[PDB]
Amino acid sequence: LEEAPWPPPEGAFVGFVLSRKEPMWADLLALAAARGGRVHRAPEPYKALRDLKEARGLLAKDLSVLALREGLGLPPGDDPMLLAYLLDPSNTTPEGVARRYGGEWTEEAGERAALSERLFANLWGRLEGEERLLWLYREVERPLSAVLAHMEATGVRLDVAYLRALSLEVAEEIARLEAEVFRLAGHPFNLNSRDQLERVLFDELGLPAIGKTEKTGKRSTSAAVLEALREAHPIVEKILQYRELTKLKSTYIDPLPDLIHPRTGRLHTRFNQTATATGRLSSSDPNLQNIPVRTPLGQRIRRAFIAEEGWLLVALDYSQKELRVLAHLSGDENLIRVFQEGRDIHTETASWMFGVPREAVDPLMRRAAKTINFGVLYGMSAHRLSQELAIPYEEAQAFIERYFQSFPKVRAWIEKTLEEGRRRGYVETLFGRRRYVPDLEARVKSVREAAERKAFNMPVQGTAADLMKLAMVKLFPRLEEMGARMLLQVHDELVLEAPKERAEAVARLAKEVMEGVYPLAVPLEVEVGIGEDWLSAKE
DNA sequence: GACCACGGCGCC
DNA sequence: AGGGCGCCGTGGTC
Ligand SMILES: Nc1ccn([C@H]2CC[C@@H](COP(=O)(O)OP(=O)(O)OP(=O)(O)O)O2)c(=O)n1
Ligand SMILES: [Mg+2]
Ligand SMILES: [Mn+2]
Ligand SMILES: [Mn+2]
Ligand SMILES: [Mn+2]
Ligand SMILES: [Mn+2]
Ligand SMILES: [Mn+2]
Numbered sequence: 001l002e003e004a005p006w007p008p009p010e011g012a013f014v015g016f017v018l019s020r021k022e023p024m025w026a027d028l029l030a031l032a033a034a035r036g037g038r039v040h041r042a043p044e045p046y047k048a049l050r051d052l053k054e055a056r057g058l059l060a061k062d063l064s065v066l067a068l069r070e071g072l073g074l075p076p077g078d079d080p081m082l083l084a085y086l087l088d089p090s091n092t093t094p095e096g097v098a099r100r101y102g103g104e105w106t107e108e109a110g111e112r113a114a115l116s117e118r119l120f121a122n123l124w125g126r127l128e129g130e131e132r133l134l135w136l137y138r139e140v141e142r143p144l145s146a147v148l149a150h151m152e153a154t155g156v157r158l159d160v161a162y163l164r165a166l167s168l169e170v171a172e173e174i175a176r177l178e179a180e181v182f183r184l185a186g187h188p189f190n191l192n193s194r195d196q197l198e199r200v201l202f203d204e205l206g207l208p209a210i211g212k213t214e215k216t217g218k219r220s221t222s223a224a225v226l227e228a229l230r231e232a233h234p235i236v237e238k239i240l241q242y243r244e245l246t247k248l249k250s251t252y253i254d255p256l257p258d259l260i261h262p263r264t265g266r267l268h269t270r271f272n273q274t275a276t277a278t279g280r281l282s283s284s285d286p287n288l289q290n291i292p293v294r295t296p297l298g299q300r301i302r303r304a305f306i307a308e309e310g311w312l313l314v315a316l317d318y319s320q321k322e323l324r325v326l327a328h329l330s331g332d333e334n335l336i337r338v339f340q341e342g343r344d345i346h347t348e349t350a351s352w353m354f355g356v357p358r359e360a361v362d363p364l365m366r367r368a369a370k371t372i373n374f375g376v377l378y379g380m381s382a383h384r385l386s387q388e389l390a391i392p393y394e395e396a397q398a399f400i401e402r403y404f405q406s407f408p409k410v411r412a413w414i415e416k417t418l419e420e421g422r423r424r425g426y427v428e429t430l431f432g433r434r435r436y437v438p439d440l441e442a443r444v445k446s447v448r449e450a451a452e453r454k455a456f457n458m459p460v461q462g463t464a465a466d467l468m469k470l471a472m473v474k475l476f477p478r479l480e481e482m483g484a485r486m487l488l489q490v491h492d493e494l495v496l497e498a499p500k501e502r503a504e505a506v507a508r509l510a511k512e513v514m515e516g517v518y519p520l521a522v523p524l525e526v527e528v529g530i531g532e533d534w535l536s537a538k539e
Numbered sequence: 540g541a542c543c544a545c546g547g548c549g550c551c
Numbered sequence: 552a553g554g555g556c557g558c559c560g561t562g563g564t565c
Contacts, residue, residue: 192560194546215545222547247548250559278555280551287557290550298549321551370551371553378553385553449552457554461551465555491551491555 001039001114007051008033008040013120014057015112016045022285023065024152024261024268032109034117039110049074057116058094058105061145061152061273068153069263076145080116083123085274086133086141089435092274101126132432140431140469141273147476147486148271148281155266156288156487156495159304160257166300167253170245177242184235191242197221207232228387248292252301259286271489278458279433279465281489289490291534294367305534312503312530314484315537316510318468318492319525320345322374325463328520329430332409339522349373352399353389376403377410379453417456427455429462467524468492471517475510482506495534503530 012035018026031045033052042048052074055063060076067074084091084101091097098105102122103115127134182188185204189196195218201207202219209219210228223243229236261268267286275282283289291305292298307313318324323345327335338345350361350369361369376385376399386396404411421427422441426434435458439451472489479486484498484506494514498506507528514526531537 190561193562195561213546218546220546243548247559251549255558272556275557276555280555282556284557287550290548290557292549294549374551375553380553383552446552453553454555461555493551 001034001110002037004038004040006033006040006042006048008035008038010053011035011056012040013113013117014052014055014060014063015109015114015116016059016063017107017109017112018062018066022268022270023062024069024155026066028066030109032113034110034113039114041110045109046070058097058112058119061149064146064149065152068149076149078120078142079145080119080123081274082137082141082145083120083127086136086433087123087126087130089274089277089279089433133434136431136433136466140466140473143473144469145273147472148273150476151486151488152268152270154485154487154497155261155264155268156497157265157306157308158256158260158267159306160260163253163257163301163304166304167249170249170253170297174242174245174249177238177245181235181238181242184233184238191239192246194218194221197239201229201235205233205235207236224387244295245297248295248297248301252292256286256304269488277435277454279429279462279469280491281465281469283488288488293535294364299535302535303533307497307532310500311497312500312532313487313534313537314496314498314503314507314510314528314530315534316494316496316507316514316526316528317538318464318514319527321464321492321524322460323377324520324522324524325430325460325467326377326410326413327522329459329463330407330409330413331521332407332413335407335410336522339525345373346370376400378457379449414456417459418452421455427458429459429466431463431466433462433466435462464492467517468494471514474517475513478509478513479506482509495537 012033015032015034016028017030019029020026028045031042031048033040049067049070049072054077055074056077058080060079064074064076081094081097084097091100094105098115098119101119103118105115106112178191181191185200189200191197198219198221201221202209207229210225211220212218213220223240226236226240256267259267269283269288270285272282272284292301324339327339346366346369347358347361349372350365351358353369353372354361354365382393382397382400385400386393389396417427418440421437425438426436428434437451437455439447440455442448442451468489468491472486472494476486479496482502482505484496484502486494487497488495494510496506496510507530511526511528515524517524529537529539531539
């Protein structure tokens with residue numbers, strides 16, 4: 001390319017280099033743009049950001065987040081990564097996409113700008129004629145990247161002092177548990193080491209091994225194994241409690257307060273848009289899509305996510321999301337009718353596994369039922385179900401037969417999905433998002449059947465993801481108009497922040513947008529709560 | 540210091 | 552014979 005002075009013309013492709021992957025934390029080391037057979041390199045990258053009207057190129061959203069951090073409204077536009085990801089969701093990195101579609105991802109801005117330009121041309125070519133993939137790009141992914149940039153740059157408020165205090169209390173309890181485990185083992189060892197624990201449990205103590213690990217075939221010490229051994233030795237329950245507390249302390253309580261951004265005073269995640277096989281988003285650095293919620297200590301941690309003074313959090317969560325999507329994809333009349341009588345399958349399953357009335361099923365009971373319903377739906381074995389329910393194998397067998405007898409059109413849909421997947425080599429969501437699943441014709445049964453479960457899950461999980469993304473795209477401009485913020489997405493949940501005087505109106509509006517995003521054969525229902533913290537906003 | 544594979548486990 | 556993720560500490564290499 002011909003070396004040309006900064007700035008570039010309108011519509012140029014940008015290339016940029018960051019000191020680290022997280023745009024809220026990165027130093028912008030270099031900035032370039034490419035167009036019309038020219039490459040333009042910015043003398044000073046921060047100042048040069050001001051000259052761009054749009055971030056167009058590889059990883060556009062990341063540059064847009066950095067610009068928002070610097071007080072500049074630089075929206076992301078075309079990004080070859082999104083084109084590649086729609087062609088084949090195994091396209092998740094610029095390294096791989098470059099090598100596959102006509103270049104090399106280097107560490108130089110100018111080369112990255114030229115690359116973005118060439119990859120865009122090639123990928124746009126590959127997508128001509130792919131009308132539904134093009135619809136997803138224009139109507140969902142490209143616009144969504146702008147929404148995600150705003151969410152990332154906004155961040156969420158955290159009660160840091162609360163978590164610091166919590167760390168000291170939890171440390172004391174961890175010490176109590178550790179001391180008691182060591183007393184029982186007859187000696188201290190590294191309780192965090194599953195290898196040392198394995199020897200203590202199965203060699204030193206007399207305990208029976210229950211299962212083996214996948215890659216190396218060691219005797220497993222997983223929670224499932226431990227729970228099966230709960231009454232074989234007092235040391236077991238102590239280890240399970242130690243595991244719960246250290247998991248929560250090491251993963252959330254200790255690291256999160258250290259991640260508060262000095263300028264915003266808030267916590268900023270990344271919403272990765274080309275990271276999953278199904279079309280879901282993911283969240284990283286830190287992951288805010290797996291904040292605890294199940295145990296009492298977990299709930300204590302979730303309470304640390306709070307609204308700005310004068311604002312409230314609004315949490316919206318699709319009810320029985322994937323079951324409703326299944327109803328639409330399959331057309332089962334019984335399952336559809338369930339959602340037209342306002343029945344709740346999670347509640348009904350919970351009343352059965354706990355042997356209590358439906359009105360006796362509490363939130364945490366109902367939640368327990370989710371792993372069971374989704375577990376059985378996507379191919380859980382009777383043996384496994386037997387083990388998690390602690391019921392005779394024959395009992396698990398009958399629950400799984402009855403589960404599918406009730407909704408007969410579902411198995412039909414599964415078989416149709418698998419057949420089409422074998423023939424075309426990919427499966428697809430309601431909107432035509434594809435996942436290639438080559439192992440559908442593997443000659444090894446375990447491999448083939450794993451592939452099958454992946455394959456028939458994807459249209460369901462991925463259609464739900466398509467709907468959530470579309471809803472975010474529709475909802476965001478309404479929130480901006482009302483002076484509200486979108487903070488987090490958690491697969492089928494959104495967390496918003498609204499001024500107190502407007503929170504009720506925001507909640508009502510957001511609920512309507514989400515419920516009416518794309519009318520299906522069954523209603524999509526949304527549960528919404530408002531609160532000063534994330535936990536109380538879902539209570 | 541970075542990076543890896545693994546087991547393990549937090550959420551959806 | 553649940554699916555989809557990302558992060559932790561260990562054990563380890565470079
Ligand atoms: N153990 C789980 C939990 C969730 N999911 C998927 C399917 C549902 C989707 C959304 O998660 P939830 O909100 O927790 O499930 P829900 O059916 O929508 O339950 P709820 O009515 O309480 O929101 O994520 C799953 O595959 N396996
Ligand atoms: Mg949810
Ligand atoms: Mn904007
Ligand atoms: Mn104390
Ligand atoms: Mn839900
Ligand atoms: Mn692993
Ligand atoms: Mn799983």
